[PDB]
Fold:
Amino acid sequence: GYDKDLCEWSMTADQTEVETQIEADIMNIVKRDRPEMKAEVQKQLKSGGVMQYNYVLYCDKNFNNKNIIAEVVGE
Amino acid sequence: EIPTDDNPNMSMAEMLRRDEGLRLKVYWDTEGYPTIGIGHLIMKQPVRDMAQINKVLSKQVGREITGNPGSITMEEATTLFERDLADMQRDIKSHSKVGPVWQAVNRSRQMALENMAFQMGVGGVAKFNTMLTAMLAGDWEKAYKAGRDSLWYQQTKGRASRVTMIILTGNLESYGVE
Ligand SMILES: [Cl-]
Ligand code: NA
Ligand code: NA
Ligand code: NA
Structure:
């Protein structure tokens, strides 16, 4: 998705703050859509990282954020 | 069967902004290495001292980096990316293990290999012996299975899933490219 404020902030703010926000947004989508995947998503955020998802989540209107679950876990 | 895409409508810049994200200030990767831009590794050491990081980044960018965390512009992120992409694309073609595979496969499968090399280096891709052997033989199912039988797949499963799907199918439908 594209959100002007979150795009700019995620590109520039303190890593820890940005990762907290990305993780919260991902976990909200997980809870809404596929709540059974919560722990699996968390494992992959820990092993694979969090920051990389800023662009698809906030800086790209061509990405539908519902697809972030598959983006993280692969299904 | 499943169609291949010999001229996929996606650039590596697009693919890697998606997979690597986009930062205009320093962050640290999962190995603790200072990074910026689109997966631009500033130093291959787990340095946290921003004065040191900024001095190195200043040389790479060409002007004095300020701030903590240090900051670059979008133009500078683009310039760094173009160079990193050029380096990887040259080296993936020449390496004696990965290169012959790259030469033999279609552009979609090349992008899969390039994506891996941007993540782990050309030398990292070269460790996928079984996968690369299978690709050179056209045994896409064996290559797919080998790629998923890896620490890479367990640690970055989402990215490895969509990349291995390219290896299997020869198209970029796993990245939304019809
Ligand atoms: Cl340090
Ligand atoms: Na923006
Ligand atoms: Na460019
Ligand atoms: Na190339």
